[PDB]
Paper text:
To identify possible oligomerization sites, we solved the crystal structure of Armc8β after crystallization of selenomethionine-labeled protein by single-wavelength anomalous diffraction at the selenium edge and refined the structure at a resolution of 2.7 Å. The crystals contained three chains (denoted as p, i, and a) in the asymmetric unit. Remarkably, each copy exhibited a distinct conformation, thus demonstrating dynamic flexibility of Armc8β especially at its termini. Chains p and a are more similar as reflected in an rms deviation of 1.04 Å after superimposition of the Cα atoms of all modeled residues, whereas chain i adopts a more compact shape; in this case, the rms deviations are 2.82 Å for the ia pair and 1.69 Å for the ip pair. In terms of oligomerization sites, analysis of the structure with the PISA server detected no significant stable assembly, which is in line with the dynamic nature of Armc8β′s oligomerization behavior. Apparently, the high concentrations in the crystal promoted the observed interactions, nevertheless, since chain p shares an interface with both chain i and chain a, it is tempting to speculate that these two interaction sites could correspond to the two sites identified when analyzing the self-association of Armc8β by SEC–MALS. Not surprisingly, the overall fold of Armc8α and its shorter isoform Armc8β are very similar. However, in our structure we could model an additional short α-helix at the N terminus. The conformation which Armc8α adopts in the complex is more closely related to the less bent conformation observed for chains a (rms deviation of 0.93 Å) or p (rms deviation of 1.05 Å) of Armc8β, than to chain i (rms deviation of 1.94 Å). Human and mouse Armc8α are very closely related (overall identity of 98.51% with only two substitutions in the crystallized region), and the C-termianl extension, which is unique to Armc8β, is very flexible and therefore could only be partially resolved (5–9 residues). It is more likely that structural differences arise because Armc8α is being present in a complex, whereas Armc8β was analyzed in isolation.
The CTLH (C-terminal to lissencephaly-1 homology motif) complex is a multisubunit RING E3 ligase with poorly defined substrate specificity and flexible subunit composition. Besides the reciprocal incorporation of Wdr26 and muskelin, another known alternative assembly path of the CTLH complex involves the mutually exclusive incorporation of the Armc8α subunit or its shorter isoform Armc8β (673 versus 399 residues). Both subunits share the first 378 residues comprised of seven Armadillo repeat motifs. The remaining scaffolding subunits, Armc8β and Twa1, strongly interact with each other and with RanBP9, again with nanomolar affinity.
Numbering used by the authors: 14 to 336, 343 to 389
The structure:
């Protein structure tokens, strides 16, 4: 490791200072020292700052300011390497943060939830820890709608830690769909985005939840009506793609009909707009694969898609060379993903109609099949 120098030790020592004012300023200086330095994070974790910080956040005498600043620093350490997250987990930070979530003060709750978000988002953290203690999910649900930060953080934690049907149903029984639906009308886009993500992963292959989503009412509008608005071009591209995913999944589960207006006039047209040359490579791959997921079961959708906004022409441009230098290198390295996506959509488009396969064969290269 990098040698530990007197500066780092002085930061950790100032926490043990006898004057409370000096301790508070020491934790503040510690937060300002780990902003960009992952090495400073590692040095302070090895010097034992995390146990002391947790103790200072546990004390009854500690002011709300000191508790908030200590939680902030603990989150800043969790923003570093995976080794740091493992060290913080080994110091039992999640239990302490869960006790901190019992606080009335909102800023302190936000700091603890920010730390929990970074931890649960990190790969080294097992998702089962979220469900190992049954009371944490109800407690998080209760805090879901106190601030935009609680909404965003708890949505991120849930969306990253759902993991499919079993504990997805655990989350559902605690009122996930009803409590998270209201966030889609929030004045904060960051919230509205994250809620969307929660729904997309929550309804991927769970027909039961999809049906529930069809009848959920948020601010006088049925939830699919909110999704359709989030397909509009004025909205950000992410918002659109994710909305389309939700609807396609709801359509695949049976909650929405393949002949429904939201699918043929909004969702599918939106997905072809994701396949344009102007779109990013990742967006083209996801739009194409999601459209293939949508159109695979129904022949009528396949035909409609084949005649929508020169889709088969745009797909041909997946095989053409790109036309910011790091993005260009990234697009030449990941071009295989784009070509593979094009073939997935071709396979779904031409599954039942030979004339569509003839159209694609002609589009992919010069020459007409016999
Ligand atoms: Cl942050």
């Amino acid at each position: 490791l990098s040698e530990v120098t007197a500066s780092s030790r002085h930061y950790v020592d100032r926490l043990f200072d006898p004057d409370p004012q000096k301790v508070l300023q020491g934790v503040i200086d510690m937060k300002n020292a780990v902003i960009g330095n992952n090495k400073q994070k590692a040095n302070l974790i090895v010097l034992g700052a995390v146990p002391r910080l947790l103790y200072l956040l546990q004390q009854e005498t500690s002011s709300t300011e000191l508790k908030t600043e200590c939680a902030v620093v603990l989150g800043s350490l969790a923003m570093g390497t995976e080794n740091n997250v493992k060290s913080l987990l080994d110091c039992h930070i999640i239990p302490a943060l869960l006790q901190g979530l019992l606080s009335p003060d909102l800023k302190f709750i936000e700091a603890c939830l920010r730390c929990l978000r970074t931890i649960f988002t990190s790969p080294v953290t097992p998702e089962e820890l979220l469900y190992t203690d049954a009371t944490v999910i109800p407690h998080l649900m209760a805090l879901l709608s106190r601030s935009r930060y609680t909404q965003e953080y708890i949505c991120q934690i849930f969306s990253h830690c759902c993991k499919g049907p079993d504990h997805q149903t655990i989350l559902f029984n605690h009122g996930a769909v009803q409590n998270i639906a209201h966030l889609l009308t929030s004045p904060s886009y960051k919230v509205r985005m994250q809620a969307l993500k929660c729904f997309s992963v929550l309804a991927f292959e769970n027909p039961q939840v999809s049906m529930t989503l069809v009848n959920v009412l948020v601010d006088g509008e049925l939830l699919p009506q909110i999704f359709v608005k989030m397909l509009q071009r004025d909205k950000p591209i992410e918002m659109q793609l994710t909305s389309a995913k939700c609807l396609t999944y709801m359509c695949r589960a049976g909650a929405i009909r393949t002949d429904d207006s939201c699918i043929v006039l909004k969702t599918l047209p939106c997905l072809v707009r994701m396949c344009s040359k102007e779109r990013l490579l990742e967006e083209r791959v996801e739009g194409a694969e999601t459209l293939a997921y949508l159109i695979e079961p129904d022949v009528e959708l396949q035909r409609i898609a084949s005649i929508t906004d020169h889709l088969i022409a745009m797909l041909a441009d997946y095989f053409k060379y790109p036309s910011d230098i790091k993005r260009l290198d990234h697009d030449l390295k990941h071009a295989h993903e784009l070509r593979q996506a094009a073939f997935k959509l071709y396979a779904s488009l031409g599954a039942n109609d030979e004339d569509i396969r003839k159209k694609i064969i002609v589009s992919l290269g010069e020459g007409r099949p016999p």
